[PDB]
Symmetry: D3
Amino acid sequence: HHHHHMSNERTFIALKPDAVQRGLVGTIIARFEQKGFKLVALKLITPSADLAKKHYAEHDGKPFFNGLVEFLTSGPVAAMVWEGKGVVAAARKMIGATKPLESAPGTIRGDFAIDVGRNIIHGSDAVETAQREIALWFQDSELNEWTPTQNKWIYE
Amino acid sequence: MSNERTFIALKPDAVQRGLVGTIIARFEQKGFKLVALKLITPSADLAKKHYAEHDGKPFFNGLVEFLTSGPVAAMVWEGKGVVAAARKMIGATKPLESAPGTIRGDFAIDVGRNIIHGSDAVETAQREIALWFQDSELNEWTPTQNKWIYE
Amino acid sequence: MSNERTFIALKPDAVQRGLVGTIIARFEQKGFKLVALKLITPSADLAKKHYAEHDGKPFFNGLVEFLTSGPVAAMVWEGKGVVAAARKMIGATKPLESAPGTIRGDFAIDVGRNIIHGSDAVETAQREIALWFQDSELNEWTPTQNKWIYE
Amino acid sequence: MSNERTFIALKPDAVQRGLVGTIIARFEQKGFKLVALKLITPSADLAKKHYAEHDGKPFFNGLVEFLTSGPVAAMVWEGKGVVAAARKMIGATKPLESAPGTIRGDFAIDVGRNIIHGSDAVETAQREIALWFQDSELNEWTPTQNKWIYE
Amino acid sequence: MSNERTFIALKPDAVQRGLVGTIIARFEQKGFKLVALKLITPSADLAKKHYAEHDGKPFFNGLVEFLTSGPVAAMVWEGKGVVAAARKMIGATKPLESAPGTIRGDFAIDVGRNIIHGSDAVETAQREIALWFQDSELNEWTPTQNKWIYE
Amino acid sequence: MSNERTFIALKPDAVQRGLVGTIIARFEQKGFKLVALKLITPSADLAKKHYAEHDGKPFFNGLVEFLTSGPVAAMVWEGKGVVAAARKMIGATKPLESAPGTIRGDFAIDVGRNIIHGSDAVETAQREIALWFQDSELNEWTPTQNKWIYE
Ligand SMILES: [Mg+2]
Ligand SMILES: [Mg+2]
Ligand SMILES: [Mg+2]
């Protein structure tokens, strides 16, 4: 079933329009680089309504769905894929709590945000949703196949 | 709710250790709005009033003496949940009980040299702001970035 | 003289862009001593007095209108050569001609949005300090770190 | 003039050395506007076109081989004077001769491992942006902070 | 109690990844006093004695082989509660479960590449300091800033 | 030659002011290789040998007394052009005349509290490394990142 390393796990991260308008793109990317995660794909895109609706499909029909979609489509988003052992759960830990005010100092939302509706970043919630979100936001040709030299020091 | 305010003082240890700008930047980066700021050397009267809840406790004199001993950066921050959030950003009362990432967890060791005061509740914040600042020292302004801070 | 002082103002662009703490920290890390600090929204008359040398010039009204358009972090720094050193730390009048590492070089683009004012000479610093601060707003203190900053 | 654009590529050494976010942040903090950004592994045909002015010179093959040897963060920045400003931020051709504070000065040693490319002029930026990005990849947006960046 | 000491090693992964200065700075900024520091490539004998508690366990040979594989920054820090505080600063054994703001949480992924060792108790710290450092390598000094670190 | 080496000393002011990790990180981020490092309180004889070219000048004794007055972080860095590059990173002899971005420009004011020494030439580096380090204190290792640092 499984490959000898789960270090090829991938997650989807979006820096939402608030992150871009607040000048947080490089700061947040650097937190993932310094952790040892590998950047596989990255693009600045203004999402279409279809992409946003499909991204948020689990919330379709709920009262707050339209607001989520309207915000995500309102301006540029930095969409990316990170690879490494445990990356899905680790990125969620790095992001913090859903409510930024309850997020710990040191997390992205704890350091930089206040409101749930302006909470800077999305990360996939599980391996399966990460797989779905990566394929929704990126074609295979956009995924970069490379080998970080530093992995000798990242991975045993 | 987003007009809630809290009082922050960077105590004489913070000023002597060169932490004023570093700490202010943490509140700016979080999205809180700076309403008032000054460097002052608190009088004994101001320090006793600041710590009035502890009147007659054995540790009261030490708190007052330290706060009056040198310059303090006093300020007011505004935003949703700012009183409780500033306490979370500061950390535990005892720096060694405070987490990495908090102000006290990153920068301090001794409870008597714990860098910063933040109000403990909305009511004490209102009292402390009024104690330390005249109304004329409070700046009325609207951050352009609030479009991206607040939904 | 190690007691030289300069006046620094972080203008409304610096405040709106969240640069107050970042900039203060550069002065603290250099070893300069913070003597006074306040957040104030300048009146037109204060701005006209600050920019008195430019009254009559085609850019004067814009300077005054901009300075009064939001809060300003006004402060006084002390140390050897602080007037000229602060100007070096700030950069050129044009941010686009300012070197990386300077405040304007790292953070700004336009002359009219160039973040910070510092006095241009000892005599203008003395004037600007007295204009912006009453004597009782200046803090008298001795940083213990000076043992390691000054020979 | 404030709609000028430049092309920046963070080359395979920048990506392998973990410098992508750090360098992007230097452009964001300066006030330049990110118009487009992607991680791409340049094909031989793209790299040869990028370096076309050097076709036939002894060092051409090495430039193409290095640029195709790993991912590249390719991007477009907009703002007044951005072409020359980015060149100033990058530093000198030789990293060892680049000033502290510049990207090459802070992070690089060898000309052949020079971290970053920026367009050298408006006309070359126009060519490079069109080569590396389809028009559909360029995001049209208005930073609300521009009232504090531009006069 | 303020003269408690702990032993810290930045293991070969920390040195190869360029984290020596970044990590030392976190201990300096907290108020801990650097007593001893050296870059050493541990011998097999030293590494086996360092990990003696694990001798005869299946993972012992791997720990020893890794620690001896390249240079290590070994050091001694002094201050109140330094042993437990350094462990909190380090994080959990698993970097993936270490909180943001900790050294392992910010910088690492794998248990076998977890950057840093800190003594687990006062007694093991005393043993490790004496194992790695002769008494003549310990520096006796008084930080001026301790007026502000300690009450 | 990529194996050129220079001697760097972070003098007692650097250690007292908490700048050890910050400065080491600047050399690491540049791509230079740490060969040796130790915290030592220099003996009077070592300080006199370090400053021997000034013997018989009135300021020799002041230099010696300062260098012995607290711990010193002594180290050896390796890489192409490291002697001249470290001098550029340090800045000018007078900190007030050193550019922002340099170590002395960012952190110092007085020539007599100038934070750091770096060898002035390859020949003096060879002498200084041999004076401050025994050969067995030099670490032989190969950074895996060198394929991205060097062509
Ligand atoms: Mg008039
Ligand atoms: Mg006139
Ligand atoms: Mg060697």
